[PDB]
């Protein structure tokens, strides 16, 4: 099921650039096997560069499920987790993140060395409780794959 | 310049628990002497965790100016950045930061232990070269004060 979840979000990142929505991210946000989110990056159709997939699949799920916490919740995301949305994530109580890609994989096509310290253990004013897990195998090829097949079919943020 | 706009930033604060949008913090965004946005958290208002009051300054602050980079802009914040925030202020090119109390300030009446790394320069990955200027004398006291005069008069988060 990890996998089918990984796949979708990995989905929306090819859907997002495709649409022009953004950078080629995809978050999907799961209520166990029902999905309650799935987003891609939206900075630029929404001028906002908050916009990012994990954040916007934060935004629908809490709207969806009509509450402020998803503690019951786990999440996706095609790349790592920014510092901004491994905040995000960790503010909405989400209890565990799968993601596909190390972030070196999206910075090497020219997004910011911008990588969270309390995603990878490496925090110290910022404790991280939730159970994360970092894809191998085919979710991590897939997720990787993402930046070399979008690669010049968008524009960096 | 940064005494009246962290004062402002206050206000909002307070006036965003008077209202019931959301928690005692406030954020404006000003580009030298002019106010592109004024906000305060809206956590409970939207439905959303992640509309603290720095990331609802920066979308609308975004969506006034139709761009997502804020490069000739800067923020004040009545309490320090929280990682989540800090992160999308670094995203959205805001050039200074100027906040007002300290987290510790806000943890004393109930709120997360939750500090950005890179604000403090702690991290191993995040690394900030962003101004921050954290505020002393008048306009410090005035911003911490907010968390005591305000402690039970909204819904924690
Ligand atoms: O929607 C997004 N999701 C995840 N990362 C993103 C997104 N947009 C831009 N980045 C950028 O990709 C790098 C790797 O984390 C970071 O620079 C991050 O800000
Ligand atoms: O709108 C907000 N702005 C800044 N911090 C906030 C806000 N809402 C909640 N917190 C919380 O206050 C503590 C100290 O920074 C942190 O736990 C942070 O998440
Ligand atoms: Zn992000
Ligand atoms: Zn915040």
Chains 1, 2 share one sequence.
């Not at 990984?6 to 997002?16: P, R």
């Not at 080629?24 to 309650?36: C, L, R, S, T």
């Not at 699949?57 to 019951?72: P, V």
């Not at 786990?74 to 565990?96: D, N, Q, V, W």
């Amino acid at each position: 099921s990890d996998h089918k979840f990984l796949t979708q979000a990995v989905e929306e990142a090819y859907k997002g650039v495709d649409c022009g929505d953004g950078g080629p991210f995809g978050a999907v946000i799961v209520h166990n096997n029902e999905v309650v989110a799935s987003c891609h990056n939206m900075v630029l159709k929404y001028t906002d560069p908050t916009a990012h997939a994990e954040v916007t699949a934060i935004r629908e799920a809490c709207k969806k499920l009509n509450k402020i916490e998803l503690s019951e919740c786990e999440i996706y995301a095609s790349c790592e987790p920014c510092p901004m949305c491994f905040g995000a994530i960790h503010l909405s109580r989400l209890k565990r993140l799968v993601y596909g890609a190390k972030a070196e994989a999206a910075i090497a096509i020219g997004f910011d060395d911008f990588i969270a310290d309390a995603l990878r253990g490496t925090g110290v004013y910022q404790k991280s409780s939730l159970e994360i897990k970092k894809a191998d195998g085919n979710g991590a090829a897939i997720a990787e794959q993402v930046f070399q097949n979008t690669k010049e079919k968008f524009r960096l943020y």
